Design a binder for these strands. Structure first.
Ligand SMILES: [Zn+2]
Lengths: 148, 117, 187, 179, 205, 349, 184
DNA sequence: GGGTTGGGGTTGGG
């Protein structure tokens, strides 16, 4: 009954693989993991990926202790610039001598489409990792017990 | 386009693993000053120090305070350094909560989400 | 010590509550989507002037004090607070609104926030205000939320107001999540 | 002012009487206006000089209002298919009627007795001249056989020729001023 | 000279406004952007809707919406999803037709009031329009243009863009005003002629 | 000094047929006039009232009105106003603000009230089109002689039967059970010609902005208001633009029935701190009074004007009848038809 | 929005239509032939169908639907209803904007359905024509509800908390008593 | 601790 759920790269991978393997579901873009959802919360390091001949779409990468996911970054059309939250990451990366950092990212995924990443914030505290893990486990338990 | 599985383990179980492509996280050591980077586990009340040989102590940013390493342990206290990112931390890192998180993760009921099978 | 409740718990208790009931809660959440369609501020006197007599040419005169008063601007903001569970609309008053304004921009002084907003609006500089409000999006905090089951215009309604806003710190929130999950596992 | 109800003479009489009422209605407004000298206001002095600011302001207002009213009246009376020459001739006739009424009313007032009356008389003379010139040119325009007239255009031509607008206006005045 | 006319065209009237630089119907805009071609065939109703629909913009953006050979146009999202994406992209701006009766909460949009114009927005004609256009171009077309659709013999209904009412909008001393209106309709009567007992003339003693 | 003295020592007002001209009267004279006017009104239509009789529900739900008297040649002219709102009992609106929903509903009713169930007119456009049709028919006939009759009703508002009005409202099928209210903005061309191409030209130079409300039924009506959201009449081909709004409202026939019953029965007005209550008819000055009066008298006139429905083909006689509020005008070709109309109207009265 | 639906007064229309159905059934089955009364008393089949008149149309927000059992949930303000619909054709006729859920709809017509089951009578409400107007993604938390798919047990539930629900339940029970008295 | 939308303007019929 909630459209936003927190999960990590491995959960993304298994959900996508299961949806592709078994497409006999409802004719709607919503995924199915103890319900329908469109938003996800994940904390992992981000790194730019250099695409070719692909100006409108910017390809990302989120490697984590469980796996890696590919996301697409969209930019404005009337003028060619970057969203402020990603310009902040770019300037931080150039300032800190090209060192990647973990980020707290919120991203939207739909089946038969790429995974769009809307916003993220750079995290500098390590306790956020444990916070995200515990929140993930608690939310999964809540969803499982609310299904029944 | 590829998948690498990087489990998070506390101090006690690298001996039981005896070498897997894993990840570890800890605070940087500076009281010892070895040639290579050395990090410690826990709140430093008990001595649990591990050294990584691939990565040099000084090449990191001076403001860096906390780090994690994703890589295979070669021998006890010696862990290979393949991927390394930095965290400057103004707040001391709690270790017991991370411990319980790792245990729960190792629990069979939540192990299905954290790792395959 | 304090006890923290979730947005869904607050919603259920507010619904089950009878008219005229109040209760307070403490929640880990993030502010989002500040609304500015309605009037952003109102005028009150220093002596708590209940009625402010409007005149022309920026003239003001309180009734609770009966002196020629310089108008005092009080900032009124509407936004939405939301945890991982649910979302609700909240009322933000002068003190909290000024606190967030000074936090996002240290240049503007605490009680100077309302005057700064009024000056920008009257001069016709709304892009700056919009950008400042947008910079506050997904700002994690610790919220003290009170709900009131009150009747307005012979219509029952529930109103949510934020009382305290504090800087967030992950340690005790993670501890609370850990004990909650351990309790759930035990049960 | 529906043309389906009145004829051309009826419309002219209606406009005549309505204008005669409205000028007396509006007279107190310029009486009040003359109580203020605009030469002390820069906003109006820079635009109308300093000698006859009130007279220039009143003349401009009257001229533009009359022109707008005449345009609206022509739009209401005629359809888009009617000839532009007919439209212009009727607009000139209406403008002359309005200006003649205004001049006749205001020619006796003491405050307007001097500078303004000459300008209003000039405007009325210009309108009469333009109406006569348009009426004279319309005959040559229609003689080219380039246009086919409908029943309404034929009625308008017959009306204009019967009232002999080519020479003067003395024929139509008894018909429109009857009370 | 200039004459008033009983019959006028919305496009002709709009071309007389200096603020608007580009005014054209949807069909010619699509032909200029090469999203469609004359050789292509469409339903008669869709063609009539394209011809009657009138769009306008403050600047010339034909080049910005020029057809791009990098990637074709196929649609997989819903029209509601595209509209929600456009509304989210609109952000804090609060004067647009599409935002009427709805509110934005983060990356979620909520509908809470009745808007009779949403039928035109979600109609099959707009569905086919989106199919022709594409998501990325539609989301910005709904913002960069003022959309007017004919629904009567001469009436038009605006369904997107900045609301038209937005175009219809150091101090100096202002003296007080004489309260002359207070004189009228006073039915009170008192034993001694003078003024009311509440006045300061009588309150002093 | 000046305003308080004039207020205390004089009653200042305007007469009936003197327009906006101002007149002054000494206070005792106005006291005598007020006493005499009270005496006149009590015998005819007003009665002194006690708050015990009026139910507390309506007492706390509806505000009361004020009465004002304008001098007339040999008589007066009462005017009752309903501007006040009760600060106590949680009242924030006056009677007109309460009843403007029913006013919208009855304004919708006015459209089919024009031609269906009587001879009622409301605006110069309707008057002009009726006149044009009659003129065309007269031209077709061949310009025969014409005769006219003019008469009007005295105090139409006070001569309205409350029970008859309520019965007509209940049994009238032109009023549906439920209605929905829509708000929208209309942009319409002004009377300014188009400039031909000094640089600052905007929409207000060519268009006028108006706020409009409308009430529509849930039936699958021909006008299909659900598809558009507006219902406008244009006398030209010039275009216009409409944008909708997000503030809808619902009104039920039962609410209108309750409002009509309350205003018919428990109408309370005050004068010199003395309360009064109407005994017959509806109070003038309410936004629905004109429409209600037109409908009520249209019922009786359609009852008693059966012959006119068939006369124009029975013997081919051209005849025209209009009624604006309480004023009647009838032009025909048959003196017999005119006499019959006079007789039938007298019988109906 | 809630006020707009609360002003509809759905209970009035429901009571009037129920009274009309009861009266029509009473007058149309005054034959009182004993063998005919016996033979139309059979398990799980409809016996009468009364379509509502044009005056009693109302609008509600769809909260949930179920295609397998043809169960549709309606709500407005404080009260939510669970009714059935004729078939999928009703859904296809209603040009839904995106989805049946969270869409404001107007009921063009519906009909009361009477059924005999388990030695008693159950009254069903079936929606016949549907029309969507606009999408309302606002969750209304209805404290109170009545069920038309469970009969007297599904209607008399929670009656003590609503006066209108109490009156409608009393009318329903009286209608059931009259029906059983006439038929048996 | 807040809260329809308060005006501005005044002609011609009823
Ligand atoms: Zn004060």
């Amino acid at each position: 009954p909630q459209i936003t759920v927190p999960l990590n790269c491995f959960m993304i991978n298994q959900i996508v693989k299961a949806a592709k393997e078994n497409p006999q579901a409802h004719s709607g873009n919503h995924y199915e993991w103890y319900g329908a959802f469109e938003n996800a919360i994940i904390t992992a390091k981000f790194e730019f990926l250099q695409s070719i001949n692909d100006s409108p779409k910017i390809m990302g990468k989120l490697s984590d202790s469980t796996g890696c996911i590919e996301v697409v970054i969209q930019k404005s059309k009337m003028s060619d610039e970057l969203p402020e939250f990603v310009q902040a990451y770019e300037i931080e990366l150039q300032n800190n001598g090209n060192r990647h950092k973990y980020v707290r990212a919120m991203l939207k995924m739909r089946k038969n489409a790429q995974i769009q990443l809307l916003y993220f914030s750079i995290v500098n505290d390590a306790n956020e990792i444990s916070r995200h893990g515990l929140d993930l486990c608690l939310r999964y338990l809540q969803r499982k017990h609310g299904i029944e | 386009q590829e998948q690498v599985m990087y489990p998070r383990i506390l101090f006690e179980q690298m001996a039981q693993f005896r070498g897997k492509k894993v990840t570890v996280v800890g605070n940087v050591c500076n009281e010892d000053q070895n040639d290579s980077l050395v990090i410690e586990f826990g709140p430093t009340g008990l001595n649990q120090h591990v050294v990584i040989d691939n990565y040099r102590r000084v090449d990191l940013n001076n403001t860096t305070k906390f780090v994690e390493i994703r890589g295979v342990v070669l021998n006890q206290n010696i862990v290979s350094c393949e991927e390394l990112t930095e965290f400057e931390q103004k707040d001391p890192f709690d270790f017991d909560t991370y411990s319980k998180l790792i245990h729960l993760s190792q629990s069979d009921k939540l192990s299905s989400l954290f790792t395959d099978q | 010590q304090r006890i923290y409740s979730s947005i869904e718990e607050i919603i259920q208790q507010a619904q089950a509550s009878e008219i005229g009931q109040k209760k307070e809660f403490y929640v880990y959440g993030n502010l989002v989507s500040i609304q500015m369609k309605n009037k952003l501020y109102y005028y009150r006197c220093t002596c708590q002037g209940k009625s402010v007599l409007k005149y022309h040419g920026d003239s003001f005169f309180c009734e609770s004090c009966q002196q020629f008063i310089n108008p005092q601007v009080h900032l009124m903001l509407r936004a939405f607070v939301q945890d991982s569970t649910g979302t609700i609309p909240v009322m933000i008053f002068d003190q909290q609104s000024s606190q967030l304004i000074n936090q996002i921009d240290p240049s503007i002084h605490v009680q100077e926030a309302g005057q700064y907003v009024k000056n920008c609006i009257e001069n016709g500089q709304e892009e700056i205000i919009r950008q400042l409000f947008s910079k506050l999006d997904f700002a994690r905090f610790i919220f003290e939320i009170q709900f009131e089951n009150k009747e307005f215009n012979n219509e029952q309604e529930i109103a949510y107001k934020v009382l305290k806003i504090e800087k967030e710190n992950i340690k005790e929130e993670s501890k609370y999540l850990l004990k909650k999950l351990e309790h759930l596992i035990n049960n | 002012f529906n043309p389906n109800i009145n004829s051309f003479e009826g419309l002219c009489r209606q406009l005549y009487h309505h204008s005669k009422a409205t000028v007396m209605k509006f007279y107190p407004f310029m009486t009040k206006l003359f109580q203020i000298d605009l030469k002390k206001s820069k906003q109006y002095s820079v635009q109308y000089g300093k000698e006859n600011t009130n007279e220039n302001f009143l003349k401009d207002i009257l001229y533009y209002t009359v022109e707008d009213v005449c345009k609206i009246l022509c739009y209401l009376q005629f359809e888009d298919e009617i000839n532009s020459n007919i439209k212009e001739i009727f607009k000139n006739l209406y403008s002359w009627i309005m200006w003649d009424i205004i001049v006749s009313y205001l020619k006796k007032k003491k405050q307007f007795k001097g500078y303004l009356n000459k300008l209003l008389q000039k405007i009325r003379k210009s309108r009469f001249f333009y109406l006569k010139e348009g009426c004279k040119s319309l005959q040559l325009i229609l003689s080219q056989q380039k246009y086919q007239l409908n029943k309404k255009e034929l009625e308008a031509i017959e009306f204009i020729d019967l009232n002999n607008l080519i020479q003067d206006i003395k024929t139509l005045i008894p018909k429109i001023s009857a009370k | 000279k200039q004459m008033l006319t009983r019959k006028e065209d919305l496009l002709t009237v709009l071309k007389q406004i200096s603020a608007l630089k580009y005014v054209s119907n949807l069909y010619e805009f699509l032909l200029a952007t090469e999203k469609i071609v004359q050789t292509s065939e469409l339903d008669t109703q869709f063609q009539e809707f394209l011809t009657t629909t009138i769009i306008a913009s403050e600047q010339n953006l034909v080049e910005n919406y020029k057809q791009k050979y990098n990637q074709p146009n196929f649609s997989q999202l819903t029209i509601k999803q595209v509209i929600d994406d456009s509304i989210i992209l609109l952000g804090n701006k609060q004067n647009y037709v599409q935002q009427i009766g709805t509110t934005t909460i983060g990356f979620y949009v909520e509908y809470e009031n009745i808007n009779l114009s949403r039928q035109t927005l979600y109609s099959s004609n707009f569905r086919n329009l989106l199919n022709i256009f594409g998501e990325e171009d539609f989301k910005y077309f709904l913002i960069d243009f003022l959309v007017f659709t004919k629904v009567e013999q001469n009436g038009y209904l605006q369904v997107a863009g900045v609301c038209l009412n937005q175009y219809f909008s150091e101090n100096q001393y202002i003296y007080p005003e004489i309260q002359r209106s207070q004189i009228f309709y006073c039915n009170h009567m008192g034993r001694e002629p003078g003024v009311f007992k509440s006045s300061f003339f009588n309150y002093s003693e | 000094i000046v305003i308080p003295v004039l207020r205390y020592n004089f009653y200042i007002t305007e007469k009936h047929k003197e327009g906006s001209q101002i007149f002054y009267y000494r206070k005792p004279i106005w006291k005598l006039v007020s006493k005499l006017t009270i005496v006149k009104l009590e015998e005819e239509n007003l009665e002194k009232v006690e708050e015990k009789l009026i139910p507390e529900d309506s007492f706390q739900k509806y505000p009361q009105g004020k009465l004002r008297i304008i001098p007339k040649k040999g008589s007066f002219r009462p005017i009752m106003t309903f501007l006040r709102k009760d600060k106590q009992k949680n009242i924030k609106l006056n009677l007109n603000q309460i009843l403007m929903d029913s006013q919208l509903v009855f304004r919708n009713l006015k459209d089919m009230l024009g031609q269906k169930i009587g001879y009622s007119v409301f605006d110069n456009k309707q008057i002009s089109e009726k006149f044009a049709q009659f003129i065309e028919k007269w031209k077709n006939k061949g310009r025969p002689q014409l005769y006219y009759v003019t008469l009007d009703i005295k105090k139409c508002y006070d001569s309205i039967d409350q029970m008859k009005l309520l019965n007509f409202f209940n049994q009238s099928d032109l009023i549906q059970d439920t209605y929905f209210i829509n708000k929208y903005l209309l942009f319409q061309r002004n009377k300014r010609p188009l400039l031909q191409i000094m640089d600052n030209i905007n929409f207000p130079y060519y268009f006028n902005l108006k706020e409009r409300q409308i009430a529509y039924s849930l039936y699958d009506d021909d006008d299909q208001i659900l598809q558009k959201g507006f219902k406008e009449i244009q006398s030209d081909d010039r275009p216009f633009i409409v944008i909708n709004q997000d503030k809808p409202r619902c009104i039920t026939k039962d609410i209108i029935h309750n409002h009509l019953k309350h205003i018919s029965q428990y109408n309370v007005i005050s004068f010199n701190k003395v309360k009064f209550r109407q005994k017959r008819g509806i109070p003038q000055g309410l936004n629905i009074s004109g429409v209600l009066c037109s409908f009520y008298f249209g019922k009786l006139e359609e009852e008693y004007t059966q012959f006119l429905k068939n006369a124009e083909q029975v013997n081919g006689s051209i005849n025209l009848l209009m009624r604006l509020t309480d004023d009647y005008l009838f032009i025909s070709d048959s003196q017999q038809n005119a006499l019959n109309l006079i007789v039938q109207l007298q019988n109906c009265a | 929005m809630k006020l707009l639906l609360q002003n509809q007064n759905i209970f009035q229309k429901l009571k009037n239509t129920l009274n009309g159905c009861i009266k029509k059934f009473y007058d149309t089955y005054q034959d009182l032939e004993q063998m005919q009364k016996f033979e139309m008393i059979v398990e799980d089949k409809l016996l009468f169908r009364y379509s509502c008149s044009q005056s009693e149309m109302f609008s509600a927000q769809i909260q949930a639907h179920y295609l397998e059992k043809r169960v549709l949930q309606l709500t407005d303000g404080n009260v939510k209803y669970i009714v059935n619909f004729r078939d999928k054709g009703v859904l296809d006729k209603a040009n839904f904007f995106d989805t049946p859920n969270n869409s404001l709809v107007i009921i063009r017509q519906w009909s009361y359905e009477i059924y005999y089951t388990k030695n008693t009578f159950q009254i069903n409400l079936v929606i016949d024509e549907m029309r969507c107007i606009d999408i309302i993604t606002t969750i209304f938390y209805c404290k109170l509800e009545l069920d038309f798919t469970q009969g007297i047990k599904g209607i008399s539930k929670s009656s003590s908390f609503s006066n209108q629900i109490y009156e409608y339940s009393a009318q329903y029970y009286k209608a059931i008593q009259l029906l059983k008295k006439l038929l048996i």
